[PDB]
Structure formats: C-alpha cells, structure tokens
C-alpha cells in the first residue's frame, strides 16, 4: 500500500486491451469463461483481435508465445 504498490495484476483485461488501456469482460479466469459460455472480450470480438492471457503467462515465468 505505502511501500509495495504497482499496477499490473489488477487489470484483468486480455492481452490486447491491457496494452491499449482497455478494460474488458475477460476476468481472471477467461479460460473458465470460455467453458462457462464466454469466449473473447468485447474488444477482441469487436475489432477481431486475439483474446489471450499471455500477459498472465509471462508473469511468474517468461512464457513464450
Ligand atoms: Zn480485452
Ligand atoms: Zn480480448
């Protein structure tokens, strides 16, 4: 709060939106979202981008694409 503070994980928006400062429906479980019925955030579906949580992948470990 006072010492430790950063903005990265609070953003749930998928790869393309978080980059473009866009907040989407894509939760922290967009994968499970697909299972539930979701598939891609309105941004990806609107601009026909690519809904992915690569940002999430390269966090703890620099996961490649
Ligand atoms: Zn998005
Ligand atoms: Zn998306």
Fold type of domain 1-65:
CD2-Gal4 (4.10.240)
In terms of Cβ atoms closer than 10 Å to its own Cβ (0-12, 13-18, 19+), residue 48 is exposed
Question: What's the gap in Å between 38 CA and the centre of ligand 1?
Answer: 12
Question: What's the gap in Å between 4 CA and the centre of ligand 2?
Answer: 29
- The answer to whether the beta carbons of residues 8 and 18 sit under 8 Å apart is no
- CA end-to-end span of the chain, whole Å? 33
Angle at 14 between CA 13 and CA 17, to 5 degrees: 70
Annotation-wise, does 40 bind a ligand?
no
Q: What is the C-alpha to C-alpha distance for residues 65 and 54, in angstroms, rounded to an integer? A: 7
Q: What is the C-alpha to C-alpha distance for residues 27 and 37, in angstroms, rounded to an integer? A: 13
Annotation-wise, does 15 bind a ligand?
no
Q: What is the C-alpha to C-alpha distance for residues 17 and 20, in angstroms, rounded to an integer? A: 5
Annotation-wise, does 4 bind a ligand?
no
Show Cβ contacts of residue 43 under 8 Å, excluding neighbours closer than 6 positions.
13, 14, 16, 17, 20, 22, 24, 49
Burial of 3-26, coded b for 16+ CB within 10 Å and e otherwise, reads eeeeeeeeebbbbbbbeeebebbb
């Amino acid at each position: 709060g006072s010492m430790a503070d950063t903005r990265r994980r609070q953003n749930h928006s998928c790869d393309p939106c978080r980059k473009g400062k866009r907040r989407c429906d894509a939760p922290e479980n967009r994968n499970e979202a697909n299972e539930n019925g979701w598939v891609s955030c309105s941004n990806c579906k609107r601009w026909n981008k690519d809904c992915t949580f690569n940002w999430l992948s390269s966090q703890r470990s620099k996961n490649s694409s």
